Short mmCIF file of all heavy atoms in Angstrom, two decimals:
data_model
loop_
_atom_site.label_atom_id
_atom_site.label_comp_id
_atom_site.label_asym_id
_atom_site.label_seq_id
_atom_site.Cartn_x
_atom_site.Cartn_y
_atom_site.Cartn_z
N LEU A 69 0.81 -1.21 0.00
CA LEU A 69 0.00 0.00 0.00
C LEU A 69 0.85 1.27 0.00
O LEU A 69 0.48 2.27 -0.61
CB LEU A 69 -0.94 0.00 1.20
CG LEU A 69 -1.99 -1.11 1.21
CD1 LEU A 69 -2.63 -1.24 2.58
CD2 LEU A 69 -3.05 -0.85 0.15
N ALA A 70 1.99 1.22 0.69
CA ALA A 70 2.91 2.35 0.71
C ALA A 70 3.55 2.52 -0.66
O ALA A 70 3.76 3.64 -1.13
CB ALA A 70 3.97 2.16 1.77
N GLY A 71 3.85 1.39 -1.31
CA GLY A 71 4.41 1.40 -2.64
C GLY A 71 3.43 1.99 -3.64
O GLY A 71 3.82 2.74 -4.54
N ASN A 72 2.15 1.66 -3.47
CA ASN A 72 1.10 2.21 -4.31
C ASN A 72 1.01 3.72 -4.18
O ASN A 72 0.91 4.44 -5.18
CB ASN A 72 -0.26 1.59 -3.95
CG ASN A 72 -0.29 0.09 -4.16
OD1 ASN A 72 0.57 -0.48 -4.84
ND2 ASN A 72 -1.29 -0.57 -3.58
N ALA A 73 1.06 4.20 -2.94
CA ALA A 73 0.96 5.63 -2.65
C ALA A 73 2.13 6.40 -3.23
O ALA A 73 1.98 7.55 -3.65
CB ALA A 73 0.86 5.85 -1.15
N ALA A 74 3.30 5.77 -3.25
CA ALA A 74 4.49 6.40 -3.82
C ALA A 74 4.34 6.56 -5.33
O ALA A 74 4.81 7.54 -5.90
CB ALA A 74 5.73 5.58 -3.49
N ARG A 75 3.68 5.59 -5.95
CA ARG A 75 3.50 5.59 -7.40
C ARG A 75 2.54 6.68 -7.87
O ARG A 75 2.76 7.32 -8.89
CB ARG A 75 3.00 4.22 -7.87
CG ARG A 75 2.48 4.22 -9.30
CD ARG A 75 2.56 2.83 -9.89
NE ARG A 75 3.81 2.17 -9.52
CZ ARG A 75 4.47 1.33 -10.31
NH1 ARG A 75 4.02 1.06 -11.53
NH2 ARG A 75 5.60 0.78 -9.89
N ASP A 76 1.46 6.87 -7.12
CA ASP A 76 0.46 7.88 -7.44
C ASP A 76 0.98 9.28 -7.11
O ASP A 76 0.42 10.28 -7.54
CB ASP A 76 -0.84 7.59 -6.70
CG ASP A 76 -1.23 6.13 -6.76
OD1 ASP A 76 -0.78 5.43 -7.69
OD2 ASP A 76 -2.00 5.67 -5.89
N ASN A 77 2.05 9.32 -6.32
CA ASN A 77 2.78 10.56 -6.10
C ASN A 77 3.98 10.59 -7.04
O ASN A 77 4.83 11.47 -6.97
CB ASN A 77 3.23 10.67 -4.64
CG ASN A 77 3.69 12.07 -4.27
OD1 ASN A 77 3.23 13.06 -4.83
ND2 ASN A 77 4.60 12.15 -3.30
N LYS A 78 4.01 9.61 -7.95
CA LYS A 78 5.06 9.46 -8.95
C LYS A 78 6.46 9.50 -8.32
O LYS A 78 7.37 10.13 -8.85
CB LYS A 78 4.94 10.51 -10.07
CG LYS A 78 3.60 11.29 -10.15
CD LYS A 78 2.37 10.38 -10.32
CE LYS A 78 2.27 9.77 -11.71
NZ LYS A 78 1.00 9.01 -11.87
N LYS A 79 6.60 8.83 -7.18
CA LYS A 79 7.90 8.63 -6.55
C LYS A 79 8.30 7.16 -6.64
O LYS A 79 7.45 6.28 -6.58
CB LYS A 79 7.87 9.07 -5.08
CG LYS A 79 7.45 10.52 -4.86
CD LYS A 79 8.50 11.49 -5.37
CE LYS A 79 8.19 12.91 -4.93
NZ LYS A 79 8.23 13.04 -3.44
N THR A 80 9.59 6.90 -6.81
CA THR A 80 10.07 5.53 -6.89
C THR A 80 10.68 5.09 -5.56
O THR A 80 11.15 3.96 -5.42
CB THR A 80 11.12 5.35 -8.00
OG1 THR A 80 12.27 6.14 -7.70
CG2 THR A 80 10.55 5.78 -9.34
N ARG A 81 10.67 5.99 -4.59
CA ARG A 81 11.22 5.69 -3.27
C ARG A 81 10.18 5.95 -2.18
O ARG A 81 9.62 7.04 -2.08
CB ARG A 81 12.47 6.53 -3.00
CG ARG A 81 13.09 6.30 -1.63
CD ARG A 81 14.24 7.27 -1.39
NE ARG A 81 15.29 7.13 -2.40
CZ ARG A 81 16.09 8.11 -2.79
NH1 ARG A 81 15.96 9.32 -2.27
NH2 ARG A 81 17.02 7.88 -3.70
N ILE A 82 9.92 4.93 -1.37
CA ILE A 82 8.96 5.04 -0.27
C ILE A 82 9.52 5.89 0.87
O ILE A 82 10.62 5.65 1.35
CB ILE A 82 8.56 3.66 0.27
CG1 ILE A 82 7.74 2.89 -0.76
CG2 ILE A 82 7.77 3.79 1.56
CD1 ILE A 82 7.33 1.51 -0.32
N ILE A 83 8.74 6.89 1.28
CA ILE A 83 9.09 7.74 2.41
C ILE A 83 8.04 7.56 3.50
O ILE A 83 6.97 7.01 3.22
CB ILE A 83 9.19 9.22 1.98
CG1 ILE A 83 7.84 9.73 1.48
CG2 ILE A 83 10.27 9.41 0.92
CD1 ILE A 83 7.85 11.20 1.10
N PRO A 84 8.34 7.98 4.74
CA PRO A 84 7.38 7.91 5.85
C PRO A 84 5.97 8.38 5.50
O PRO A 84 5.00 7.80 5.99
CB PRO A 84 8.01 8.83 6.89
CG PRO A 84 9.46 8.62 6.70
CD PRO A 84 9.67 8.40 5.22
N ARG A 85 5.87 9.43 4.68
CA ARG A 85 4.58 9.95 4.25
C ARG A 85 3.75 8.88 3.55
O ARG A 85 2.54 8.79 3.76
CB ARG A 85 4.78 11.15 3.32
CG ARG A 85 3.49 11.70 2.72
CD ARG A 85 2.48 12.07 3.80
NE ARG A 85 1.41 12.91 3.27
CZ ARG A 85 0.44 13.44 4.02
NH1 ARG A 85 0.41 13.21 5.32
NH2 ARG A 85 -0.49 14.19 3.45
N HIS A 86 4.40 8.07 2.73
CA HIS A 86 3.73 6.99 2.01
C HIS A 86 3.26 5.90 2.96
O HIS A 86 2.19 5.33 2.78
CB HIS A 86 4.65 6.40 0.94
CG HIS A 86 5.14 7.41 -0.05
ND1 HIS A 86 6.40 7.35 -0.61
CD2 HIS A 86 4.54 8.50 -0.59
CE1 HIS A 86 6.55 8.37 -1.45
NE2 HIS A 86 5.44 9.07 -1.45
N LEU A 87 4.06 5.62 3.98
CA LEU A 87 3.69 4.65 5.01
C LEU A 87 2.46 5.13 5.77
O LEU A 87 1.56 4.34 6.06
CB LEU A 87 4.86 4.41 5.97
CG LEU A 87 6.11 3.75 5.40
CD1 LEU A 87 7.23 3.74 6.42
CD2 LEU A 87 5.78 2.33 4.95
N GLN A 88 2.43 6.42 6.09
CA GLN A 88 1.31 7.01 6.81
C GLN A 88 0.05 7.02 5.95
O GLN A 88 -1.04 6.70 6.43
CB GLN A 88 1.65 8.44 7.25
CG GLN A 88 0.49 9.18 7.91
CD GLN A 88 0.27 8.78 9.36
OE1 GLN A 88 0.39 7.61 9.72
NE2 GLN A 88 -0.06 9.75 10.20
N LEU A 89 0.20 7.39 4.68
CA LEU A 89 -0.92 7.39 3.74
C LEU A 89 -1.50 6.00 3.58
O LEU A 89 -2.70 5.84 3.38
CB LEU A 89 -0.48 7.93 2.38
CG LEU A 89 -0.26 9.43 2.23
CD1 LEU A 89 0.28 9.74 0.84
CD2 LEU A 89 -1.55 10.18 2.48
N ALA A 90 -0.64 4.99 3.67
CA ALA A 90 -1.05 3.61 3.49
C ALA A 90 -1.81 3.08 4.71
O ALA A 90 -2.81 2.38 4.57
CB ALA A 90 0.16 2.74 3.21
N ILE A 91 -1.32 3.43 5.89
CA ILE A 91 -1.89 2.92 7.14
C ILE A 91 -3.23 3.56 7.47
O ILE A 91 -4.19 2.87 7.81
CB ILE A 91 -0.91 3.13 8.31
CG1 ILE A 91 0.34 2.27 8.11
CG2 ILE A 91 -1.57 2.79 9.63
CD1 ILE A 91 1.51 2.70 8.97
N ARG A 92 -3.30 4.89 7.37
CA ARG A 92 -4.50 5.63 7.75
C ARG A 92 -5.63 5.48 6.74
O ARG A 92 -6.80 5.70 7.07
CB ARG A 92 -4.16 7.10 7.96
CG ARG A 92 -3.04 7.35 8.95
CD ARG A 92 -3.27 6.59 10.24
NE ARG A 92 -2.09 6.59 11.11
CZ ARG A 92 -1.97 5.84 12.20
NH1 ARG A 92 -2.95 5.02 12.55
NH2 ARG A 92 -0.87 5.91 12.93
N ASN A 93 -5.29 5.11 5.51
CA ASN A 93 -6.30 4.90 4.47
C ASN A 93 -6.81 3.46 4.45
O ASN A 93 -7.80 3.16 3.78
CB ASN A 93 -5.74 5.27 3.09
CG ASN A 93 -5.73 6.77 2.85
OD1 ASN A 93 -6.70 7.46 3.14
ND2 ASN A 93 -4.62 7.27 2.33
N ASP A 94 -6.13 2.58 5.17
CA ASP A 94 -6.58 1.20 5.31
C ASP A 94 -7.19 0.99 6.69
O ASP A 94 -6.52 1.17 7.70
CB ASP A 94 -5.43 0.22 5.07
CG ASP A 94 -5.88 -1.22 5.09
OD1 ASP A 94 -6.42 -1.70 4.07
OD2 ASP A 94 -5.71 -1.88 6.14
N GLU A 95 -8.46 0.59 6.71
CA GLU A 95 -9.24 0.51 7.94
C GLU A 95 -8.67 -0.47 8.97
O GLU A 95 -8.79 -0.25 10.18
CB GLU A 95 -10.69 0.12 7.61
CG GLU A 95 -11.64 0.17 8.79
CD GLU A 95 -13.08 -0.10 8.38
OE1 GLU A 95 -13.50 0.39 7.31
OE2 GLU A 95 -13.79 -0.80 9.13
N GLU A 96 -8.05 -1.55 8.50
CA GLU A 96 -7.56 -2.58 9.40
C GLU A 96 -6.12 -2.33 9.86
O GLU A 96 -5.75 -2.71 10.97
CB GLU A 96 -7.66 -3.96 8.74
CG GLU A 96 -9.10 -4.41 8.51
CD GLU A 96 -9.19 -5.83 7.99
OE1 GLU A 96 -8.24 -6.28 7.32
OE2 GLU A 96 -10.22 -6.49 8.25
N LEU A 97 -5.32 -1.68 9.02
CA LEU A 97 -3.97 -1.29 9.41
C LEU A 97 -4.02 -0.08 10.34
O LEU A 97 -3.21 0.05 11.26
CB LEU A 97 -3.11 -0.99 8.19
CG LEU A 97 -2.61 -2.20 7.40
CD1 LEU A 97 -1.85 -1.75 6.16
CD2 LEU A 97 -1.74 -3.08 8.28
#
């Protein structure tokens, strides 16, 4: 999910922001 968020931000490197976007947007995480 973090990798997905990085792609839609057109980044090839996962940053903390992507991890946060992934966790808070997923109900179970």
Side-chain angles (χ1 to χ4, degrees):
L69 296 166
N72 299 344
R75 167 156 319 215
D76 316 337
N77 194 29
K78 346 303 287 185
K79 303 291 190 63
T80 63
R81 179 186 300 151
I82 292 179
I83 62 178
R85 175 56 165 184
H86 302 145
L87 294 173
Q88 176 78 322
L89 285 176
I91 294 163
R92 305 310 169 190
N93 282 315
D94 184 81
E95 188 175 320
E96 293 186 332
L97 284 176

